[PDB]
Design a protein around this motif. Structure first.
Motif, PDB file in Angstrom:
ATOM      1  N   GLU B  42      -5.132  -5.589  -7.240  1.00  0.00           N
ATOM      2  CA  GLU B  42      -5.110  -7.044  -7.122  1.00  0.00           C
ATOM      3  C   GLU B  42      -3.781  -7.534  -6.596  1.00  0.00           C
ATOM      4  OE1 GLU B  42      -6.565  -8.598 -10.920  1.00  0.00           O
ATOM      5  OE2 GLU B  42      -8.411  -7.549 -10.443  1.00  0.00           O
ATOM      6  N   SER B  43      -3.844  -8.491  -5.661  1.00  0.00           N
ATOM      7  CA  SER B  43      -2.665  -9.044  -4.998  1.00  0.00           C
ATOM      8  C   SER B  43      -1.759  -9.741  -6.011  1.00  0.00           C
ATOM      9  CB  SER B  43      -3.075  -9.990  -3.848  1.00  0.00           C
ATOM     10  OG  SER B  43      -3.656 -11.176  -4.267  1.00  0.00           O
ATOM     11  N   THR B  44      -2.373 -10.101  -7.118  1.00  0.00           N
ATOM     12  CA  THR B  44      -1.710 -10.757  -8.229  1.00  0.00           C
ATOM     13  C   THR B  44      -0.998  -9.835  -9.251  1.00  0.00           C
ATOM     14  OG1 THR B  44      -3.875 -10.873  -9.324  1.00  0.00           O
ATOM     15  CG2 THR B  44      -3.133 -12.874  -8.092  1.00  0.00           C
ATOM     16  N   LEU B  45      -1.064  -8.513  -9.060  1.00  0.00           N
ATOM     17  CA  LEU B  45      -0.439  -7.534  -9.993  1.00  0.00           C
ATOM     18  C   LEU B  45       1.071  -7.766 -10.238  1.00  0.00           C
ATOM     19  CD1 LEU B  45      -2.190  -4.137  -8.890  1.00  0.00           C
ATOM     20  CD2 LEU B  45      -2.609  -5.332 -11.083  1.00  0.00           C
ATOM     21  N   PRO B  46       1.554  -7.520 -11.475  1.00  0.00           N
ATOM     22  CA  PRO B  46       3.011  -7.539 -11.737  1.00  0.00           C
ATOM     23  C   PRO B  46       3.767  -6.537 -10.846  1.00  0.00           C
ATOM     24  CG  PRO B  46       1.758  -6.856 -13.718  1.00  0.00           C
ATOM     25  CD  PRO B  46       0.753  -7.255 -12.689  1.00  0.00           C
ATOM     26  N   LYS B  47       4.936  -6.924 -10.341  1.00  0.00           N
ATOM     27  CA  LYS B  47       5.607  -6.077  -9.356  1.00  0.00           C
ATOM     28  C   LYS B  47       6.185  -4.780  -9.937  1.00  0.00           C
ATOM     29  CE  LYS B  47       8.088  -6.166  -4.961  1.00  0.00           C
ATOM     30  NZ  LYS B  47       9.452  -6.233  -4.345  1.00  0.00           N
ATOM     31  N   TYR B  48       5.749  -3.680  -9.316  1.00  0.00           N
ATOM     32  CA  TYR B  48       6.253  -2.317  -9.521  1.00  0.00           C
ATOM     33  C   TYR B  48       6.202  -1.596  -8.172  1.00  0.00           C
ATOM     34  CZ  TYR B  48       5.643  -2.738 -14.617  1.00  0.00           C
ATOM     35  OH  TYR B  48       5.739  -3.122 -15.937  1.00  0.00           O
ATOM     36  N   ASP B  49       6.984  -0.526  -8.043  1.00  0.00           N
ATOM     37  CA  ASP B  49       6.848   0.395  -6.919  1.00  0.00           C
ATOM     38  C   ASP B  49       5.372   0.795  -6.705  1.00  0.00           C
ATOM     39  OD1 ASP B  49       9.591   0.230  -6.729  1.00  0.00           O
ATOM     40  OD2 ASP B  49       9.950   2.261  -7.547  1.00  0.00           O
ATOM     41  N   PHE B  50       4.964   0.982  -5.444  1.00  0.00           N
ATOM     42  CA  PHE B  50       3.599   1.433  -5.111  1.00  0.00           C
ATOM     43  C   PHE B  50       3.661   2.792  -4.399  1.00  0.00           C
ATOM     44  CE2 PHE B  50      -0.310  -1.163  -5.332  1.00  0.00           C
ATOM     45  CZ  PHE B  50       0.158  -2.308  -5.995  1.00  0.00           C
ATOM     46  N   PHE B  51       2.603   3.575  -4.548  1.00  0.00           N
ATOM     47  CA  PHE B  51       2.389   4.733  -3.692  1.00  0.00           C
ATOM     48  C   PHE B  51       0.946   4.808  -3.255  1.00  0.00           C
ATOM     49  CE2 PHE B  51       2.101   9.068  -2.059  1.00  0.00           C
ATOM     50  CZ  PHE B  51       3.224   9.065  -1.243  1.00  0.00           C
ATOM     51  N   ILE B  52       0.711   5.157  -1.990  1.00  0.00           N
ATOM     52  CA  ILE B  52      -0.681   5.248  -1.499  1.00  0.00           C
ATOM     53  C   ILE B  52      -1.140   6.711  -1.484  1.00  0.00           C
ATOM     54  CG2 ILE B  52      -2.371   4.531   0.259  1.00  0.00           C
ATOM     55  CD1 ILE B  52      -0.501   2.319  -0.917  1.00  0.00           C
ATOM     56  N   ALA B  53      -1.862   7.096  -2.523  1.00  0.00           N
ATOM     57  CA  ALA B  53      -2.317   8.485  -2.666  1.00  0.00           C
ATOM     58  C   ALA B  53      -3.673   8.637  -2.009  1.00  0.00           C
ATOM     59  CB  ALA B  53      -2.398   8.861  -4.118  1.00  0.00           C
ATOM     60  N   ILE B  54      -3.729   8.473  -0.686  1.00  0.00           N
ATOM     61  CA  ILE B  54      -4.982   8.640   0.047  1.00  0.00           C
ATOM     62  C   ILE B  54      -4.782   9.706   1.109  1.00  0.00           C
ATOM     63  CG2 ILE B  54      -6.653   7.541   1.624  1.00  0.00           C
ATOM     64  CD1 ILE B  54      -5.889   4.872   0.121  1.00  0.00           C
ATOM     65  N   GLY B  55      -5.581  10.779   1.066  1.00  0.00           N
ATOM     66  CA  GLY B  55      -5.427  11.905   1.996  1.00  0.00           C
ATOM     67  C   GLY B  55      -5.810  11.583   3.437  1.00  0.00           C
ATOM     68  N   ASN B  56      -6.866  10.794   3.606  1.00  0.00           N
ATOM     69  CA  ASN B  56      -7.285  10.386   4.932  1.00  0.00           C
ATOM     70  C   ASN B  56      -6.207   9.540   5.633  1.00  0.00           C
ATOM     71  OD1 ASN B  56      -8.804   8.311   6.801  1.00  0.00           O
ATOM     72  ND2 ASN B  56      -9.983  10.211   6.758  1.00  0.00           N
ATOM     73  N   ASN B  57      -5.772   9.963   6.821  1.00  0.00           N
ATOM     74  CA  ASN B  57      -4.657   9.290   7.512  1.00  0.00           C
ATOM     75  C   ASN B  57      -4.999   7.862   7.938  1.00  0.00           C
ATOM     76  OD1 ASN B  57      -3.174  11.685   7.300  1.00  0.00           O
ATOM     77  ND2 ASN B  57      -3.569  12.274   9.435  1.00  0.00           N
ATOM     78  N   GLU B  58      -6.212   7.680   8.440  1.00  0.00           N
ATOM     79  CA  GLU B  58      -6.668   6.375   8.924  1.00  0.00           C
ATOM     80  C   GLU B  58      -6.710   5.360   7.779  1.00  0.00           C
ATOM     81  OE1 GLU B  58     -10.261   6.390  11.400  1.00  0.00           O
ATOM     82  OE2 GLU B  58     -10.750   4.380  10.674  1.00  0.00           O
ATOM     83  N   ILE B  59      -7.320   5.763   6.666  1.00  0.00           N
ATOM     84  CA  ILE B  59      -7.452   4.905   5.481  1.00  0.00           C
ATOM     85  C   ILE B  59      -6.087   4.696   4.806  1.00  0.00           C
ATOM     86  CG2 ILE B  59      -8.548   4.568   3.207  1.00  0.00           C
ATOM     87  CD1 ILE B  59     -10.912   6.273   4.388  1.00  0.00           C
ATOM     88  N   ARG B  60      -5.286   5.758   4.686  1.00  0.00           N
ATOM     89  CA  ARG B  60      -3.923   5.583   4.151  1.00  0.00           C
ATOM     90  C   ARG B  60      -3.113   4.525   4.950  1.00  0.00           C
ATOM     91  NH1 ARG B  60      -2.748  10.127   4.568  1.00  0.00           N
ATOM     92  NH2 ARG B  60      -0.924  10.375   5.987  1.00  0.00           N
ATOM     93  N   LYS B  61      -3.197   4.545   6.286  1.00  0.00           N
ATOM     94  CA  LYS B  61      -2.532   3.539   7.129  1.00  0.00           C
ATOM     95  C   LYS B  61      -3.029   2.101   6.858  1.00  0.00           C
ATOM     96  CE  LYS B  61      -1.372   2.434  11.927  1.00  0.00           C
ATOM     97  NZ  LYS B  61      -1.602   2.613  13.380  1.00  0.00           N
ATOM     98  N   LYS B  62      -4.262   1.909   6.700  1.00  0.00           N
ATOM     99  CA  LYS B  62      -4.856   0.599   6.464  1.00  0.00           C
ATOM    100  C   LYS B  62      -4.482   0.065   5.085  1.00  0.00           C
ATOM    101  N   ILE B  63      -4.569   0.899   4.140  1.00  0.00           N
ATOM    102  CA  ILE B  63      -4.188   0.502   2.777  1.00  0.00           C
ATOM    103  C   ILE B  63      -2.697   0.194   2.714  1.00  0.00           C
ATOM    104  CG2 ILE B  63      -4.004   1.256   0.338  1.00  0.00           C
ATOM    105  CD1 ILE B  63      -6.855   0.338   1.330  1.00  0.00           C
ATOM    106  N   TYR B  64      -1.890   1.082   3.299  1.00  0.00           N
ATOM    107  CA  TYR B  64      -0.468   0.848   3.452  1.00  0.00           C
ATOM    108  C   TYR B  64      -0.209  -0.552   4.031  1.00  0.00           C
ATOM    109  CZ  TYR B  64       4.423   1.858   4.528  1.00  0.00           C
ATOM    110  OH  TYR B  64       5.795   1.815   4.613  1.00  0.00           O
ATOM    111  N   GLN B  65      -0.920  -0.894   5.104  1.00  0.00           N
ATOM    112  CA  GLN B  65      -0.806  -2.222   5.705  1.00  0.00           C
ATOM    113  C   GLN B  65      -1.174  -3.365   4.727  1.00  0.00           C
ATOM    114  OE1 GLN B  65      -1.151  -0.948  10.491  1.00  0.00           O
ATOM    115  NE2 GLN B  65      -3.021  -1.423   9.321  1.00  0.00           N
ATOM    116  N   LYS B  66      -2.248  -3.241   4.057  1.00  0.00           N
ATOM    117  CA  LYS B  66      -2.672  -4.233   3.076  1.00  0.00           C
ATOM    118  C   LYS B  66      -1.687  -4.311   1.912  1.00  0.00           C
ATOM    119  N   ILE B  67      -1.267  -3.349   1.363  1.00  0.00           N
ATOM    120  CA  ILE B  67      -0.298  -3.384   0.256  1.00  0.00           C
ATOM    121  C   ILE B  67       1.039  -3.998   0.720  1.00  0.00           C
ATOM    122  CG2 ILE B  67       0.984  -1.963  -1.477  1.00  0.00           C
ATOM    123  CD1 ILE B  67      -2.236  -2.168  -1.781  1.00  0.00           C
ATOM    124  N   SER B  68       1.539  -3.525   1.856  1.00  0.00           N
ATOM    125  CA  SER B  68       2.790  -4.062   2.429  1.00  0.00           C
ATOM    126  C   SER B  68       2.736  -5.586   2.670  1.00  0.00           C
ATOM    127  CB  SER B  68       3.136  -3.327   3.730  1.00  0.00           C
ATOM    128  OG  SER B  68       3.200  -1.945   3.458  1.00  0.00           O
TER     129      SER B  68
END
Ligand SMILES: CC(C)(COP(=O)(O)OP(=O)(O)OC[C@H]1O[C@@H](n2cnc3c(N)ncnc32)[C@H](O)[C@@H]1OP(=O)(O)O)[C@@H](O)C(=O)NCCC(=O)NCCS
Ligand SMILES: CC(C)(COP(=O)(O)OP(=O)(O)OC[C@H]1O[C@@H](n2cnc3c(N)ncnc32)[C@H](O)[C@@H]1OP(=O)(O)O)[C@@H](O)C(=O)NCCC(=O)NCCS
Ligand SMILES: CC(C)(COP(=O)(O)OP(=O)(O)OC[C@H]1O[C@@H](n2cnc3c(N)ncnc32)[C@H](O)[C@@H]1OP(=O)(O)O)[C@@H](O)C(=O)NCCC(=O)NCCS
Lengths: 194, 194, 194
Positions: B42-68
């Motif tokens: 949720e975009s509303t989560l309390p702030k902490y460091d994030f890590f994107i543990a997704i093996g698929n490169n395409e999906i990891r990039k997209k999620i990375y973009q959304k989280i960033s």
């Protein structure tokens, strides 16, 4: 706790590396038993921890059985440089060898009598079946099931989610890319039945 | 400095190993987010460091973009046993995973979103392109350029001075022996277009 | 004891990694000599430990000879993460490179001018011949004899008990499965004469 000394059965090459691992663990003395041209195993021996330093899976299993039947404890030899996830399961006092720079990741399970040889890697959620030998530099990707008594040769690998049937051999340098439910000998890149 | 807790997005197998690396770095708690059957991002989560543990490169990039885009910091997870040259460049706070016993030699550069998986080796002066995955035991010789979004399979390797074009796949066990400027899927020893 | 500074001859890529190993050993300063476009070797140089950072086996041997002839000591560079059995023999002050995460097991012998590159493995009772190069991730199983001046390419391996004749090349990714008494270039899985 571990005993002061340890019996290492097998005084060959595999025995020498087992000696090095035992010393790394803090054992003070290694007593080699070799029925061939060293000190023979005797059921009457003073009690110490035992290790079965036999590379052959079939013979290691039989000796393991004979030693266990005489009431000896067959410990694991695990080099301090092996990196084992807190959630991995390694069967206790089960004659398992874990050599230098082996990595075992989250939730992997290692069964009795397994050898994980130098710089091998067991990825998350693997199951390595009893008395298998994953040899030097061999690597199993995530969720791989290796059957009992299997032998993965030097620098071989298995792709994610795959199973190798009991009593199979993956040859040196082989890359297993398909699920294998029937036993055999698989060689090449990709690995194919011999 | 790193936060007390970390969000790990991906709670699968890759997530479990990421958890182990975060704990190794000294994080006290890992909070798994998985939109699938765990706690949802949720975009509303309390702030902490994030890590994107997704093996698929395409999906990891997209999620990375959304989280960033939601203003979260996506840190690097680097196991303490990884050996990184003082002259190597690893892009800071860029969602990079560096697993146990990875070696990165002099003047190599690692770009955002890269996974360097267990016991992989990046030799001197390599460039590993963003959101690539160099998987378990894969090795790049000196001066190798891996393009963006590339995937090097288990136990693959690339000979010195070579380039692999963006969006390519080097299959498990493959040995790349020639320069590749056009994208594709390369398998075998030597590696050949599929 | 080691000198305060060290001359590294070769300022290329191989030189950079050698620098990293020297610094790891505690050398305070590395002085690069390169006859090509850096500071030239001179027979008149102030005395310090020397290292020959040349990847080519033939040229490394010749330079080694010339430096030795001028009375310089050519030390071994051995990364602290290399794991070397107490019963292994590594020729002293012999220009040997041992990179990070190299493992050398019981009773193996390493001869002068050898390079053991990153994450290579030399199993128990191996003999690695003078001025050979066992490159990144290459592995020799137990009792393997590598001849003088040999080159084992990235991620190659040799099965137990085998010999590779002087001046041979095992290509990147190759798996040597038969004894080789005549020199050549061997490639593939299994490795076959080119
Ligand atoms: C696969 C293996 C079990 C087969 O051995 P084998 O039954 O005695 O077979 P042979 O050595 O007589 O060779 C038979 C054929 O298979 C081939 N072959 C053997 N091993 C091979 C390998 N790993 N990859 C590809 N081909 C292989 C041989 O080249 C030969 O081919 P050919 O008939 O066209 O000349 C063995 O070669 C092997 O890879 N064992 C692994 C040993 C190991 O890794 N030790 C652990 C060290 S840590
Ligand atoms: C190369 C790869 C991407 C191709 O997968 P795919 O498109 O789904 O192909 P398939 O599995 O259906 O196989 C197609 C053919 O290519 C071959 N092939 C697949 N992977 C191969 C490999 N790595 N080496 C040689 N051949 C391979 C198959 O044997 C098959 O041959 P066939 O048609 O003659 O029977 C995949 O096999 C792979 O190597 N991925 C790597 C996964 C990995 O390493 N995971 C990371 C773990 S850390
Ligand atoms: C084997 C080797 C020495 C041969 O190099 P070369 O004589 O210049 O040969 P080429 O690159 O021109 O290729 C000639 C043929 O052999 C093949 N070949 C080259 N290297 C190969 C390899 N390692 N495995 C299988 N085939 C290989 C090529 O595909 C080519 O086949 P083709 O004629 O059908 O197209 C070289 O490719 C090699 O593997 N060197 C290792 C370098 C290395 O590992 N560096 C250390 C990094 S740590």
């Amino acid at each position: 706790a571990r005993t002061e000394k340890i019996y290492i059965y097998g005084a060959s090459g595999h025995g020498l590396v087992c000696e090095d691992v035992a010393k790394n663990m803090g054992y003070k003395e290694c007593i080699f038993l070799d029925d061939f041209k060293g000190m023979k195993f005797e059921s009457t021996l003073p009690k110490y921890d035992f290790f079965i330093a036999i590379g052959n899976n079939e013979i290691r299993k039989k000796i393991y059985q004979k030693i266990s039947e005489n009431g000896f404890k067959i410990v694991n030899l695990i080099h301090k440089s092996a990196l084992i996830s807190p959630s991995a399961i390694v069967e206790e006092n089960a004659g398992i060898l874990i050599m230098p720079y082996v990595v075992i990741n989250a939730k992997a399970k290692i069964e009795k009598g397994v050898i994980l040889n130098t710089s091998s890697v067991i990825e998350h959620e693997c199951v390595i079946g009893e008395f298998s030998h994953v040899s030097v530099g061999a690597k199993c990707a995530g969720n791989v099931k290796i059957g009992k008594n299997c032998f993965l040769g030097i620098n071989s690998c298995v792709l994610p989610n795959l199973s190798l049937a009991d009593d199979s051999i993956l040859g040196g340098g082989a890359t297993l890319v398909k699920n294998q439910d029937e036993k055999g000998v698989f060689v090449g890149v990709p690995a194919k039945r011999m």
